[PDB]
Write an enzyme that holds these catalytic residues in place. Structure first.
Site, PDB file in Angstrom:
ATOM      1  N   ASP A 102      41.186  36.221  42.704  1.00  0.00           N
ATOM      2  CA  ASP A 102      42.639  37.153  42.462  1.00  0.00           C
ATOM      3  C   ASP A 102      43.231  37.086  43.803  1.00  0.00           C
ATOM      4  O   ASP A 102      42.909  37.807  44.693  1.00  0.00           O
ATOM      5  CB  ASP A 102      42.168  38.641  42.014  1.00  0.00           C
ATOM      6  CG  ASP A 102      43.074  39.312  41.954  1.00  0.00           C
ATOM      7  OD1 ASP A 102      44.453  39.095  41.765  1.00  0.00           O
ATOM      8  OD2 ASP A 102      42.906  40.622  41.852  1.00  0.00           O
ATOM      9  N   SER A 160      61.903  34.279  45.507  1.00  0.00           N
ATOM     10  CA  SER A 160      62.445  33.045  44.592  1.00  0.00           C
ATOM     11  C   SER A 160      63.763  33.311  44.775  1.00  0.00           C
ATOM     12  O   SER A 160      64.389  34.108  44.806  1.00  0.00           O
ATOM     13  CB  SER A 160      61.852  33.525  43.435  1.00  0.00           C
ATOM     14  OG  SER A 160      62.526  32.490  42.492  1.00  0.00           O
TER      15      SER A 160
END
Length: 330
Positions: free
Chosen positions: A35, A199
């Site tokens: 994770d 992004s």
């Protein structure tokens, strides 16, 4: 040193991925959820409330000759999905795919919440976010990667998750045969403890690319792709019959649909998530309404590039002095 381990979907929908981890002496092998969105290595154990164990493999520190109780240390964690766990702490030897850390903090669960009990395939979590998020008190502990880093050939690990198929986590090297083209690296902020990046935009199917900054985290421990409501609406508007269902808790779509792809920007590069990656199957057994793999992050407080996104890429978690993230197509 290096390590390399295969990671395997827990079910036919890629709801999560498990990777075998050796703990203790002699080794006790547990299948952990790696994770990159948290920083605790915790396990089902001989200390876990009996009624809260249902099929998981447990770590029994008393059978490990290298286990030592970390005196007075406790941990307690709550995740974004409402799940939680807590307990005490041992140090022990932990190996992943041939890479060994001695003195790793192994957080032994005394209590887990129902969703963990109900998932017999996940024996615990192995956190790979920054150690500043580790919950151990009163002395915060380091992640497996943090402990291994100095010994690695290169201070990196990579995630290469499969679509409806096994994939690979590598530590300490970049497998140049595992991706196409080049790896595009992008800046990371560690200020919130995550692999947080920006992004450069998105496209829906064959549509034009929208240049827009989207701050989010690269999180292997989150199944879906969580993005701003504007972006998510633009995606699902291309699917006839798709809608946000308050009762289900997100966007659903007719199982009869063929989904469009979703592209996200990494600098000037582009990662294309095939439409089929965004199908998470019937909302309930036998239903013709299917759960979407792209969902709104509104009310989470952060955008999350979870497995839906990451599995479309070869992803480098670069733990250099100034960390960065790399993405390549594959």
């Amino acid at each position: 040193s290096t390590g390399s381990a295969t990671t395997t979907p827990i079910d036919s929908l890629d709801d999560a991925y498990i990777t075998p981890v050796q703990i203790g002496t002699p080794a006790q092998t547990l299948n952990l959820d790696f994770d990159t969105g948290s920083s605790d290595l915790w396990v089902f154990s001989s200390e876990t409330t009996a009624s809260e164990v249902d099929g998981q493999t447990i770590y029994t520190p008393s059978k490990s000759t290298t286990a030592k109780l970390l005196s007075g240390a406790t941990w307690s964690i709550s995740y974004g999905d409402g799940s939680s766990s807590s307990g005490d702490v041992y140090t022990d030897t932990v190996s992943v795919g041939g890479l060994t850390v001695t003195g790793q903090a192994v957080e032994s669960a005394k209590k887990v919440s129902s969703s963990f009990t109900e998932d017999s395939t996940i024996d615990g979590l192995l956190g790979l976010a920054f150690s500043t998020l580790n919950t151990v008190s009163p002395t915060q502990q380091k992640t497996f990667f943090d402990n291994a880093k100095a010994s690695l050939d290169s201070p990196v690990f990579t995630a290469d998750l499969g679509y409806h198929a096994p994939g690979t986590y590598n530590f300490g090297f970049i497998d140049t045969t595992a991706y196409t083209g080049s790896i595009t690296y992008t800046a990371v902020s560690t200020k919130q403890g995550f692999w947080e990046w920006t992004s450069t935009g998105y496209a829906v199917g064959s549509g034009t690319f929208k240049s827009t900054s989207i701050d989010g985290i690269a999180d292997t421990g989150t199944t879906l792709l969580y993005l701003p409501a504007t972006v998510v609406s633009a995606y699902w508007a291309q699917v006839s019959g798709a809608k946000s269902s308050s009762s289900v808790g997100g966007y659903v779509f007719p199982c009869s649909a063929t989904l469009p792809s979703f592209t996200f920007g990494v600098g000037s590069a582009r990662i294309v998530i095939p439409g089929d990656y965004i199908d998470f199957g019937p909302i309930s057994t036998g239903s013709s309404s299917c759960f979407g793999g792209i969902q709104s992050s509104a009310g989470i407080g952060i955008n999350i590039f979870g497995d839906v996104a990451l599995k479309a890429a070869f992803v480098v978690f670069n733990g250099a002095t100034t960390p960065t993230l790399g993405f390549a197509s594959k």
